[PDB]
């Protein structure tokens, strides 16, 4: 006993335990799904309402790192906001130093290195967040990346982070994203959200959607209200 | 970042420093080494052996020249040697810059010992795990010295260090004297290092360096292969 009290000790089998506990803490989020279309990326998050007192749109889990970059979060909230701030600062510094918008393959590496810097020393603790970055550019295409508390960043075609990650990716697999444009894919994201999180777990929930791609002309922003409403209208037919 | 800044070496109730004893016990399990001085120069010999045939024997060297007339060999841990070598070279260069004269061996040994001592009292740092043999030839008389993880140093006439060093010291007791030559010194060094060699003694398994009044130098493989003949 005593091999898991510090982040600077190796267990006899040869693995750090604190990062595993951080991953376990991350494993209690709700859900966040990201799918890249032919000409952009689409995010979708299902949010749990604790009580009627909280105002609509509180605890936003969908940030804006840059003019063309999105972000999706799972885990603790404080660390997520800190990571968002550091990513914003790094992107601003890169833009000011060189003179053009930072690509994703560099921003993801910088943030992953900053996250990994905390899992070496015994004077700090590992982060408790897992997040997803997405963007679109005219000369680069659509880009999606996933980063976890350990500090491993990968590219993806479609990913899910949170409690029911497997039950969501098993339904992403049936989807064919390589061809169809992401004007109707919001419908698929809504439908895949409503087919998870049985009502026994919690009483009710709300939906949040993002948008970035050629349709939005580079910029990342929230989906329009009418399109989202039509998305729920189409996704509500799962009862059949 | 920041360190610990509290000493990791403390006095035991019996008045002994335990970490120094552990470092010495770790040094005692290293590769054997021998050093002999006889009336014309100094000879340092060591036995190196690769695990398999994939290793390249011309990549790393056990014997390193500090400057034109000082040589040095080690026994103990592997990586801990390199930093010491670098530090010694830097100190020598500093002395040369200050006084415009080549540094005597005694001064370099004193500085290295001071470094090794200073490295066992600071905060959050374990002692070094190697032992050193230093040879030089300044102002007519040659010199041989031995360092110690605790920071002490002595002047010897014939020394065996590493694994099974007591029997080597016993062997050197009955053969060494004060009137010989460099060649006979090399021969007796090879003979006493043969007490722990494997079934075969190939030229690739021996490192020999000699320092005389012309300067320290490491013998080429051909010369060592020749010297291995006419023995045993």
């Amino acid at each position: 006993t005593g091999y898991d009290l510090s982040a600077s000790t190796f267990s006899p089998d040869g693995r750090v335990f604190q990062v595993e506990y951080a991953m376990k803490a991350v494993e209690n989020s709700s859900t966040a799904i990201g799918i890249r279309c032919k000409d952009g990326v689409v995010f979708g998050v299902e949010k749990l309402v604790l009580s009627k007192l909280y105002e609509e749109g509180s605890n936003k889990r969908l940030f804006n790192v840059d003019r063309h970059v999105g972000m999706a979060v799972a885990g603790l909230l404080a660390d997520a906001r800190s990571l968002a701030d550091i990513a914003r600062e790094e992107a601003s510094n890169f833009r000011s130093n060189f003179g053009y918008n930072i690509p994703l393959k560099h921003l993801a590496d910088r943030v992953a290195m900053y996250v990994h810097a905390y899992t070496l020393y015994s004077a700090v603790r590992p982060f408790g967040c897992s997040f997803m970055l997405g963007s679109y550019s005219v000369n680069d295409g659509a880009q999606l990346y996933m980063i976890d508390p350990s500090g491993v960043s990968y590219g993806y075609w479609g990913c899910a982070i949170g409690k029911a990650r497997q039950a969501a990716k098993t339904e992403i697999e049936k989807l064919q994203m390589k061809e169809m444009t992401c004007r109707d894919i919001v419908k698929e994201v809504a439908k895949i959200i409503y087919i998870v999180h049985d009502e026994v777990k919690d009483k009710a929930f709300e939906l949040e959607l993002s948008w970035v791609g050629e349709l939005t002309n580079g910029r990342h922003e929230i989906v329009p209200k009418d399109i989202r409403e039509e998305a729920e209208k189409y996704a509500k037919e799962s009862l059949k | 970042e920041r360190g610990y800044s509290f000493s990791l070496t403390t006095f035991s109730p019996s008045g002994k420093l335990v970490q120094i004893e552990y470092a010495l016990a770790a040094v005692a399990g290293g590769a054997p080494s021998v050093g002999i001085k006889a009336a014309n120069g100094v000879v340092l010999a060591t036995e190196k052996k690769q695990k398999s045939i994939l290793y390249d024997e011309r990549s790393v060297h056990k014997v390193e020249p500090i400057t034109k007339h000082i040589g040095l060999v080690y026994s103990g841990m592997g990586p801990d040697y390199r930093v010491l070598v670098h530090r010694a070279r830097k100190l020598a260069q500093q002395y040369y810059l200050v006084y415009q004269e080549p540094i005597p061996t005694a001064q370099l040994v004193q500085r290295v010992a001071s470094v090794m001592q200073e490295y066992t009292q600071s905060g959050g740092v374990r002692p070094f795990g190697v032992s050193l043999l230093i040879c030089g030839w300044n102002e007519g008389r040659p010199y041989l010295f031995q360092s110690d993880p605790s920071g002490a140093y002595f002047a010897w006439k014939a020394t065996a260090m590493g694994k099974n060093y007591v029997n080597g010291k016993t062997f050197l007791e009955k053969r060494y004297n004060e009137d010989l030559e460099l060649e006979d010194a090399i021969h007796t060094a090879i003979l006493t290092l043969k007490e722990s060699f494997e079934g075969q003694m190939t030229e690739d398994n021996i490192e020999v360096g000699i320092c005389n009044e012309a300067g320290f130098r490491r013998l080429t493989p051909t010369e060592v292969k020749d010297y291995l003949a006419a023995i045993a």
């Binding site: - | 000493s7 006095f11 002994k16 010199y143 014939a158 007791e173």
Partner: protein
């Protein structure tokens, strides 16, 4: 971070500091140095421990160091800390000379070194110094002087002292036979030889197993000498023949 700390500067429920006592008990081994003065000149006697058959005998000295033009010191304990302390006090003396253009008396140097040694038993959380050493010198204020240090940090003047391993027996014999203001620099050597014979269990007192240093005064020289091995065996044979004659008398 504080799980690995040993807290090497705290008190104890009985009121004493453990690390200083452990260092004190460490010096209970490893050497035997004695000094005695009664007239012009002070002497140091030391026992050599590195007595292997294959040594070079370099530097013309083993444990006797020179600190100034008219100062000398021995040491007993860990050698590396002894080197550190000697190297550190040498430039203390040098900077006093630089500032005042006048040789530094023994008292001030001893107090400065004791302050430096005490600094580690107050704060910092580091291992203390396991070194105890003797000082001898001559100054124009009080003539000849002998002193003893301590890892704890305190000091004190003396007239005959041993700080080695059998120091109890040496002190007993020193106090059993010593005169105030009569012993010149000829019988003190005989007393030192007798005490060294009794303390060390090895008989016959081989002349290469001891080291003797003397300090006398000249017109303006204040010469410090380390007498060679050719003037030791005569003292030993004189002692042994005197002892045999005394034994035959009784």
């Amino acid at each position: 971070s504080r799980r690995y700390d040993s807290r090497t500067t705290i008190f104890s429920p009985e009121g004493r500091l453990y690390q200083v006592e452990y260092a004190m008990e460490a010096i209970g081994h490893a050497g035997t140095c004695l000094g005695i003065l009664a007239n012009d000149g002070v002497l140091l006697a030391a026992e050599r421990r590195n007595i292997h058959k294959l040594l070079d005998e370099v530097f013309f000295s083993e444990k006797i160091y020179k600190l100034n033009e008219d100062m000398a010191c021995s040491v007993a304990g860990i050698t590396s800390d002894a080197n550190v302390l000697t190297n550190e006090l040498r430039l203390i003396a040098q900077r006093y000379l630089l500032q005042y253009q006048e040789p530094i008396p023994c008292e001030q140097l001893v107090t400065a070194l004791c302050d430096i040694k005490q600094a580690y038993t107050q704060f910092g959380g580091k291992r203390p110094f396991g070194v105890s050493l003797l000082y001898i010198g001559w100054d124009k204020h009080y003539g000849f002087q002998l002193y003893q240090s301590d890892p704890s940090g305190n000091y004190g003047g003396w007239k005959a002292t041993c700080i080695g391993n059998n120091s109890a027996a040496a002190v007993s014999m020193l106090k059993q036979d010593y005169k105030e203001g009569e012993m010149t620099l000829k019988s003190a050597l005989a007393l030192a030889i007798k005490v060294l014979n009794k303390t060390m269990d090895v008989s016959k007192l081989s002349a290469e197993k001891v080291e003797i240093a003397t300090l006398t005064r000249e017109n303006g020289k204040t010469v410090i000498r380390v007498l060679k091995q050719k003037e030791v065996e005569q003292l030993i044979k004189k002692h042994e023949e005197e002892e045999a004659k005394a034994e035959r008398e009784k």
